[PDB]
Amino acid sequence: EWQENKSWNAHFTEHKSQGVVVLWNENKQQGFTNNLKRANQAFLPASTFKIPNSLIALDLGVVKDEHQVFKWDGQTRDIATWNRDHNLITAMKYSVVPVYQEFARQIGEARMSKMLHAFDYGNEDISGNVDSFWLDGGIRISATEQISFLRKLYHNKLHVSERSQRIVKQAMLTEANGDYIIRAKTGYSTRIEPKIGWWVGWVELDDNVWFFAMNMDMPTSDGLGLRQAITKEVLKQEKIIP
Numbered sequence: 001e002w003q004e005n006k007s008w009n010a011h012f013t014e015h016k017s018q019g020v021v022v023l024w025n026e027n028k029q030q031g032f033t034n035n036l037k038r039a040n041q042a043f044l045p046a047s048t049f050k051i052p053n054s055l056i057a058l059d060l061g062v063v064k065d066e067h068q069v070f071k072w073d074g075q076t077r078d079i080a081t082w083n084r085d086h087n088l089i090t091a092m093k094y095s096v097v098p099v100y101q102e103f104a105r106q107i108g109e110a111r112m113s114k115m116l117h118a119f120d121y122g123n124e125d126i127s128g129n130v131d132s133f134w135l136d137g138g139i140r141i142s143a144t145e146q147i148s149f150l151r152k153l154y155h156n157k158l159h160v161s162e163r164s165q166r167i168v169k170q171a172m173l174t175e176a177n178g179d180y181i182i183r184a185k186t187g188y189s190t191r192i193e194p195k196i197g198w199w200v201g202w203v204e205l206d207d208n209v210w211f212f213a214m215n216m217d218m219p220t221s222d223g224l225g226l227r228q229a230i231t232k233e234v235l236k237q238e239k240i241i242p
């Protein structure tokens, strides 16, 4: 059911980095990774938590639909794309933290915890501030647990409405062409060591789906582009994409 392919470590050592890539072949129900131990090591989810947060906000009515505008609060932050109006799509696209902090505040501690247990999401611990626990609180999730969660989302099997899950899968849309479709979400954890970058999602093919989850040490923001690059080099190597 699982197999270790240490040849993939070259794609990390190539960039003087360390990390894990996990792949799941849905048709064959088989998983692959370069590091079985780190595949099961749990980190802060950071902005990958915007997936479950979106689901809960939509299913509870905090977010009515993907067109609803959440206006900038006027406070200039260091990321330009954050200093503007957003909807669910663009807030996901640009990982707009302050938007999702407002979602969390309206969701509330009680309902947030209840839902993460229903999702079987990571360690299901929201200890900390309700509006930042996924950045510096107690919540933890591993690469293999991300994929477990994503597979439930793909099959509309999470304990929320089908509508909520379809909308979030739309918001996750990252890349599409004649060969494949990628729905995914990035993450960047900096407040607690080790600093890491995330990329979790799946690749849709004509007749199969490849789920993926990766994280890697990220001492500086300069290497954030390696999250997608390393993943795509593994996919290319495995002939999942040209």
Ligand SMILES: CS(=O)(=O)NCc1cccc(-c2cccc(C(=O)O)c2)c1
Pocket: 079, 093, 094, 095, 097, 135, 186, 187, 188, 189, 190, 191, 221, 224
């Ligand atoms: C809360 S924090 O993440 O520790 N600091 C803010 C911060 C610092 C550097 C980069 C980002 C950023 C913004 C948009 C998109 C992405 C992405 O990886 O797709 C990353 C955010």
Ligand SMILES: [Cl-]
Pocket: 169, 170, 173
């Ligand atoms: Cl779509």
